[PDB]
Design an enzyme around this catalytic site. Structure first.
Site, mmCIF file in Angstrom:
data_model
loop_
_atom_site.group_PDB
_atom_site.id
_atom_site.type_symbol
_atom_site.label_atom_id
_atom_site.label_comp_id
_atom_site.label_asym_id
_atom_site.label_seq_id
_atom_site.Cartn_x
_atom_site.Cartn_y
_atom_site.Cartn_z
ATOM 1 N N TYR A 34 67.852 61.723 87.237
ATOM 2 C CA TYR A 34 68.125 61.206 88.569
ATOM 3 C C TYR A 34 69.485 60.526 88.606
ATOM 4 O O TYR A 34 70.182 60.629 89.605
ATOM 5 C CB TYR A 34 66.993 60.272 89.038
ATOM 6 C CG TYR A 34 66.918 58.896 88.396
ATOM 7 C CD1 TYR A 34 67.629 57.832 88.929
ATOM 8 C CD2 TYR A 34 66.141 58.656 87.267
ATOM 9 C CE1 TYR A 34 67.569 56.579 88.391
ATOM 10 C CE2 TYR A 34 66.093 57.369 86.684
ATOM 11 C CZ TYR A 34 66.812 56.339 87.277
ATOM 12 O OH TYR A 34 66.806 55.052 86.780
ATOM 13 N N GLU A 55 56.103 60.172 110.530
ATOM 14 C CA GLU A 55 54.885 60.501 111.279
ATOM 15 C C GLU A 55 54.326 61.859 110.920
ATOM 16 O O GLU A 55 53.126 62.086 111.142
ATOM 17 C CB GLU A 55 55.126 60.471 112.792
ATOM 18 C CG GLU A 55 56.074 61.554 113.345
ATOM 19 C CD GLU A 55 56.226 61.527 114.882
ATOM 20 O OE1 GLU A 55 55.196 61.422 115.605
ATOM 21 O OE2 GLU A 55 57.383 61.663 115.381
ATOM 22 N N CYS A 76 70.585 47.207 86.949
ATOM 23 C CA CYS A 76 70.455 47.477 88.374
ATOM 24 C C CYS A 76 71.587 46.855 89.185
ATOM 25 O O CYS A 76 72.290 47.542 89.925
ATOM 26 C CB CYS A 76 69.110 46.957 88.887
ATOM 27 S SG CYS A 76 68.807 47.286 90.639
ATOM 28 N N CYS A 124 71.023 50.628 90.235
ATOM 29 C CA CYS A 124 70.539 50.687 91.609
ATOM 30 C C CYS A 124 71.444 50.134 92.713
ATOM 31 O O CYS A 124 71.539 50.738 93.781
ATOM 32 C CB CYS A 124 69.181 49.983 91.695
ATOM 33 S SG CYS A 124 68.198 49.385 90.301
ATOM 34 N N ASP A 139 62.454 47.877 80.934
ATOM 35 C CA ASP A 139 62.641 49.234 80.435
ATOM 36 C C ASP A 139 62.282 49.367 78.954
ATOM 37 O O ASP A 139 61.991 50.478 78.493
ATOM 38 C CB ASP A 139 64.089 49.676 80.643
ATOM 39 C CG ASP A 139 64.439 49.951 82.107
ATOM 40 O OD1 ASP A 139 63.568 49.874 82.985
ATOM 41 O OD2 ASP A 139 65.635 50.256 82.343
ATOM 42 N N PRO A 146 75.117 49.326 92.884
ATOM 43 C CA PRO A 146 76.313 50.095 93.211
ATOM 44 C C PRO A 146 76.019 51.545 93.491
ATOM 45 O O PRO A 146 76.702 52.168 94.320
ATOM 46 C CB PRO A 146 77.192 49.940 91.958
ATOM 47 C CG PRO A 146 76.228 49.587 90.861
ATOM 48 C CD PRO A 146 75.191 48.739 91.531
ATOM 49 N N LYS A 147 75.043 52.119 92.782
ATOM 50 C CA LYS A 147 74.680 53.518 93.024
ATOM 51 C C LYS A 147 74.263 53.718 94.473
ATOM 52 O O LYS A 147 74.687 54.687 95.127
ATOM 53 C CB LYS A 147 73.549 53.933 92.064
ATOM 54 C CG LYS A 147 72.852 55.247 92.360
ATOM 55 C CD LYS A 147 71.787 55.212 93.517
ATOM 56 C CE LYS A 147 70.560 54.309 93.272
ATOM 57 N NZ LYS A 147 69.663 54.869 92.201
ATOM 58 N N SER A 207 67.019 42.401 85.556
ATOM 59 C CA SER A 207 65.998 42.341 86.598
ATOM 60 C C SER A 207 64.763 41.558 86.145
ATOM 61 O O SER A 207 64.348 40.588 86.794
ATOM 62 C CB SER A 207 65.595 43.767 87.008
ATOM 63 O OG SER A 207 66.703 44.499 87.551
ATOM 64 N N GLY A 208 64.163 41.986 85.033
ATOM 65 C CA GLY A 208 62.936 41.342 84.561
ATOM 66 C C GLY A 208 63.181 39.949 84.018
ATOM 67 O O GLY A 208 62.475 38.993 84.365
ATOM 68 N N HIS A 239 56.498 57.822 116.996
ATOM 69 C CA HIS A 239 57.355 58.925 117.443
ATOM 70 C C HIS A 239 58.591 58.383 118.141
ATOM 71 O O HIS A 239 58.472 57.453 118.959
ATOM 72 C CB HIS A 239 56.585 59.826 118.436
ATOM 73 C CG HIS A 239 57.327 61.056 118.884
ATOM 74 N ND1 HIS A 239 57.643 62.093 118.023
ATOM 75 C CD2 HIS A 239 57.719 61.463 120.118
ATOM 76 C CE1 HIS A 239 58.247 63.056 118.701
ATOM 77 N NE2 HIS A 239 58.305 62.701 119.975
ATOM 78 N N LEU A 272 72.123 63.380 89.028
ATOM 79 C CA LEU A 272 72.160 64.011 90.341
ATOM 80 C C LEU A 272 72.589 63.039 91.436
ATOM 81 O O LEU A 272 73.319 63.428 92.348
ATOM 82 C CB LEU A 272 70.803 64.596 90.681
ATOM 83 C CG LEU A 272 70.323 65.680 89.715
ATOM 84 C CD1 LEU A 272 68.982 66.192 90.203
ATOM 85 C CD2 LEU A 272 71.322 66.800 89.613
ATOM 86 N N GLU A 273 72.180 61.767 91.339
ATOM 87 C CA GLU A 273 72.639 60.764 92.290
ATOM 88 C C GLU A 273 74.153 60.606 92.238
ATOM 89 O O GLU A 273 74.817 60.554 93.278
ATOM 90 C CB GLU A 273 71.954 59.431 91.993
ATOM 91 C CG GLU A 273 70.467 59.442 92.412
ATOM 92 C CD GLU A 273 69.727 58.176 92.039
ATOM 93 O OE1 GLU A 273 70.247 57.413 91.217
ATOM 94 O OE2 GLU A 273 68.617 57.945 92.585
ATOM 95 N N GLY A 294 59.931 65.651 84.301
ATOM 96 C CA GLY A 294 58.973 64.596 84.563
ATOM 97 C C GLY A 294 58.652 64.379 86.037
ATOM 98 O O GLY A 294 57.618 63.779 86.357
ATOM 99 N N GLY A 336 71.535 37.208 71.692
ATOM 100 C CA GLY A 336 70.411 36.641 70.977
ATOM 101 C C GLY A 336 69.808 37.652 70.016
ATOM 102 O O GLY A 336 69.663 38.829 70.345
#
Ligand SMILES: Cc1cc2nc3c(=O)[nH]c(=O)nc-3n(C[C@H](O)[C@H](O)[C@H](O)COP(=O)(O)OP(=O)(O)OC[C@H]3O[C@@H](n4cnc5c(N)ncnc54)[C@H](O)[C@@H]3O)c2cc1C
Ligand SMILES: Cc1cc2nc3c(=O)[nH]c(=O)nc-3n(C[C@H](O)[C@H](O)[C@H](O)COP(=O)(O)OP(=O)(O)OC[C@H]3O[C@@H](n4cnc5c(N)ncnc54)[C@H](O)[C@@H]3O)c2cc1C
Ligand SMILES: NCCCCN1CCN(CCO)CC1
Ligand SMILES: NCCCCN1CCN(CCO)CC1
Lengths: 588, 588
Positions: free
Chosen positions: A291, A571, A149, A154, A428, A156-157, A112-113, A566, A294-295, A318, A223
């Protein structure tokens, strides 16, 4: 400060043009550069309050005060006449390509980064290389370019979460009048995995094309930074060589941890393996309470699986513990079994995975509860989700001088700089930062702009919103209630809260008073919203927009004066009135 | 201003206690009142900067400056000793119940605004009556307490939208691995309607219980305001009588318009009829191009119906026309036929509705296009959605002196006051205001607080967010692009935009580059966000939180510095960079 900034900018930029928007000599240079396909940064001094001061400081480099001025890798190259001299003599290409190093930027890690940083750097003329290598998991799983990810996180999850959500959509459909019989419908794991993997493949390929189209060199090699500017690369043929780079970005990410118990590495799997698993997991034990744990438990159960989660102490350490309990309670009421206060001792193999028929093996898990009772149960699949860890031993010789903390993460300044001044760390592995994909992307893009386009903007790591994609989703931005009370004292904290029921759940005969939201506010600071928390469908869509308001310093009064849309779940944030201190029930 | 506020507060409040939080004489009075079940407002003067000035002004009413002071309907009743005198002599109940009028508040109209106002008023001791009557539609449809949203608007409309969305969830489920065959599944209109109506029934009953539990008198009768304080009521037995009220809130809402063409009233229906329709509509023509027309067309088509929309000129007049076109294009590409530049001339009956077998009739619609071609086509159902109109002729004798505008809506000050100073108007009949349920609720609750609890806060009607629940939803907050350019000039407007693709749509093989978002910003005001627009799933959840930030004056920089939640649709608002002026394509 102007001269400090200018020195740093000139030293670091690969190709940069100091310009004014209304100068035809500047445009003359821009057009020559564009025609020659020479990418560069541009700073229009007529759009900076201190532009005039910048012009004067430039003389310290160029001996002139006018625009345009072109610099390459720290050296003044020329005004308009000199640049066109170089062009007409076919000397310009060699000028802009001259460097002590092979690359202006080497990114170690294509996630990602790192991809975000490399792509953004290339935009400003930085000659960039992105290195990525995926060390196989113990059973041999590997994947393509794009990082955690994209391949095993992120993306496939959330797709498998969607597959799980569709289970409840099928159930709901009957109540909304569709002629379906949910009880006669089954799920096919491998059909789902094939769809998910075809999408991931399109992303792997998309990144390779994106890099090629931006003149970024992609090396599928490991590397190792062996000195500040030298990266030793090992290709997939085991051929070793050295490339050099001016700036180095470390963006190597983390991998799952295994516990040190017999059988764990041999017979268990992690999330690295789950998302391409060629066989259906079947009856599954998830060890862990993060997480990720549990996901994964959540969607496996919604797909119809027999799922158990083994919890050593608490869920989602946390995170706000009231919300974590509500998350787990929903899961337990919707199929997920919990082995609480329990740890594993041993994984024994009873059947080997069937490679031909794509069926799982069989395992015996032995463990123990805090009350002294033994845990002993068979599972077809055992997933460890007990944390993730950086891997930098394999990427920096310790003699380079990049400081790591006790967990192996890189200790950085607030502009991502390591203790080696040309080496930066993002994502990370950057110690202390939220470990999230959009954080890594913003960090990398903003860093690339500072390095190669003279930008000054830093990444703001405060109040970064999150969403846990459990069966009932949990979105949050800011402090947990307990952290707010710890920091400011209970007497300075007011908490507004309410249950709610999605309209979608009424005809579908789902629960009252299970979805829940709260605002944790600071009394002495105009009821400033310190933390926002919501348990409900689409919680990431709900939460996102409020993160802008919280960044801007929203108070309770700002929420109250805003009018709801609404009918929506979100809301309800605009009409909260029950406080926890009042003791009035939040049920509706 | 303090004395102006205090005079208005004392005159208007039904039962109000001026108090301080730390005064045991005040607590003595509070406990007596609570024990006697006497509801009241309380103003704690030790929590107001001008509390001390308020104490001094109170002497102008009570001849004293101390707390507590109790007032009933404009008259000082006593300090602590006098209140307890009245209590111990069993005189207090008669004191707090004495009034020139039957009620402190009469609400004419039991819808979103009126119920919210009545409930909130009762909380502060206002003796309140809520009148509601539902004039039957031409075919005889009627419904219970709760207004348009609850019975024939936002609630059933969004439930039938959900039923439509589930069509695409069933399709998607196959791609995510579920063994469903979407092509063998059909929808049953009447099963859906029964579920929707059972939910609405629970709301009708819930309101009646809520009013009873708050000591509010509910009269199912038509009210006509015949003088400032007299409401003539006709019950369902045609018995006429008069009740009197101090404050009057007009909250009577609107009803659908019919065009003046032969057959329209006799053979067509409106949204008033659709949501309880006892027969499936079948092949349907929607005449109109409002959000009601497109929402209704949209779900009828997703339920599998043959649907045509007849459009006189443009879609969604008053909304951003780029977004309106994208909304309609999606519908047309997903089943909805459009008869563009077309108006109806006549509806002829070919079959009568089958009351026994719950089947629709059959109609011939004749019309014409602007190009001179004739329109002539048969439909089983014809729905008119060509606007809504107030009905106040039937609720105010024009001699009362309440000013209406040319459209029949009530002309109000910014605190909802009409030209008759004890009469207020809220909700859709209040001229010039956004016609939305949360607007009406905030208006009514905030008005009740000003009338009966001394509050000063007004409702803010600016930048009220909306969502159109078409098959692909459209959320918006603030100005359309064309209105922003009209107000500030094209050179002062910058528009950032991007397509996007929900992750949920990848494995499901839905469209690239159809969902779309934009921020309309003002260059000269720090790139202030003037309008936000998003076409995509869950658009109301996406939009809501940003409305808080826009209310707070968010700029583009506020969006940029906020970190996205991944993977979500909403996060794309935090990384927008393509401007319309640049001409670069927004596709991704
Ligand atoms: C199951 C799971 C679910 C997740 N869900 C979400 C979510 O919903 N939302 C969210 O925001 N975040 C989520 N995350 C976190 C997100 O994946 C990470 O924060 C993000 O991928 C971190 O990006 P990165 O650039 O720091 O490293 P990574 O994306 O991990 O990329 C590092 C790359 O560098 C490679 N590499 C390592 N060492 C070397 C080396 N010496 N040489 C060359 N290459 C090397 C690595 O193999 C990898 O390809 C999830 C993570 C997991 C494990
Ligand atoms: C198809 C449709 C879909 C809609 N969708 C949405 C949505 O998704 N989101 C949103 O925010 N808004 C939506 N609206 C608008 C919303 O319904 C209105 O803004 C809201 O109901 C207005 O509330 P109100 O209090 O002004 O009047 P209403 O809710 O219309 O209530 C007025 C009540 O007073 C009754 N009445 C009239 N005259 C008298 C009289 N003399 N005596 C006694 N009673 C009387 C009426 O019969 C009615 O019961 C929708 C509207 C429609 C028609
Ligand atoms: N892997 C570590 C998980 C804990 C990270 N926590 C940090 C603060 N955020 C803010 C939301 O309250 C909650 C999650
Ligand atoms: N029935 C009238 C519909 C037009 C009302 N419009 C007002 C402004 N809002 C703000 C969103 O841009 C868009 C809708």
């Amino acid at each position: 400060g102007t001269s400090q900034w200018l020195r740093k900018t000139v030293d670091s930029a690969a190709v940069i043009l100091f310009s004014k928007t209304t100068c035809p000599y500047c445009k003359k240079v821009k057009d020559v550069l564009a025609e020659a396909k020479i990418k560069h940064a541009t700073i229009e001094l007529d759009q900076l309050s201190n532009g005039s001061a910048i012009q004067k400081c430039l003389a310290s480099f160029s001996k002139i005060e006018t625009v345009p001025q072109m610099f390459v890798r720290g050296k003044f190259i020329g005004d308009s006449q000199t640049v066109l001299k170089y062009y007409s003599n076919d000397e310009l290409a060699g000028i802009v390509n001259e460097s002590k190093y092979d690359y202006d930027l080497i990114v170690i890690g294509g996630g990602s980064g790192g991809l975000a940083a490399g792509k953004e750097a290339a935009k400003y003329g930085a000659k960039t290389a992105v290195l990525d290598y995926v060390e196989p998991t113990p059973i041999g799983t590997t994947w393509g370019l794009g990082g955690t990810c994209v391949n095993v996180g992120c993306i496939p999850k959330k797709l498998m979460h969607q597959a799980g959500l569709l289970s409840h959509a099928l159930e709901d459909a009957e109540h909304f009048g569709w002629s379906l019989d949910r009880s006669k419908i089954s799920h096919n794991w491998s059909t789902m995995v094939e769809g998910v993997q075809s999408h991931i493949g399109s992303l792997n390929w998309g990144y390779k094309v994106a890099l090629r189209d931006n003149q970024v060199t992609y090396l599928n090699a490991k590397g190792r930074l062996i000195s500040p500017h030298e990266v030793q690369i090992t290709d997939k043929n085991q051929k070793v060589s050295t490339i050099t780079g001016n700036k180095i970005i470390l963006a190597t990410g983390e991998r799952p941890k295994y516990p040190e118990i017999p059988g764990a590495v041999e017979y268990g799997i992690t999330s690295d393996d789950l998302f391409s698993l060629p066989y259906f997991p079947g009856k599954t034990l998830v060890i862990g309470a993060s997480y990720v744990a549990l996901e994964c438990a959540g969607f496996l159960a919604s797909l119809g699986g027999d799922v158990t989660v083994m919890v050593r102490s608490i869920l989602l350490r946390g995170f706000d513990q009231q919300m974590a309990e509500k998350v787990g309670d929903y899961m337990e009421n919707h199929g997920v079994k919990f082995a609480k206060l329990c740890v594993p001792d041993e994984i024994k193999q009873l059947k080997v995975v069937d490679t031909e028929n794509n069926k799982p093996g069989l395992l015996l898990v032995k463990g123990h509860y805090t009350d002294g009772k033994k845990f002993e149960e068979e599972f077809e699949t055992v997933i460890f989700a007990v944390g993730r860890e950086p891997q930098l031993s394999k990427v920096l010789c310790e003699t380079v001088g990049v400081k790591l903390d006790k967990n192996g993460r890189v200790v950085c300044t607030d502009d991502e700089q390591t203790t080696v001044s040309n080496v930066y760390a993002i994502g990370d592995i950057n110690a202390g930062k939220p470990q999230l994909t959009p954080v890594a992307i913003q960090a990398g893009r903003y860093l690339a702009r500072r390095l190669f386009a003279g930008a000054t903007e830093l990444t703001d790591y405060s109040n970064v919103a999150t969403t846990v994609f459990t069966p009932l989703e949990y979105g949050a931005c800011g402090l947990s209630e307990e952290d707010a009370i710890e920091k400011y004292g209970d007497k300075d904290i007011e908490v507004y809260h309410s249950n709610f029921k999605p309209l979608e759940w009424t005809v579908a005969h789902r629960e009252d008073n299970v979805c829940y939201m709260k605002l944790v506010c600071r009394k002495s600071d105009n009821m400033r919203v310190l933390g926002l928390h919501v348990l409900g469908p689409n919680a990431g869509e709900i939460t996102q927009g409020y993160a802008v308001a919280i960044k801007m310093g929203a108070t309770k009064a700002d929420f109250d004066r805003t009018i709801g849309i609404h009918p929506t779940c979100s809301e309800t944030f605009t009409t909260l009135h029950v406080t926890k201190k009042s003791g009035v029930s939040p049920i509706v």
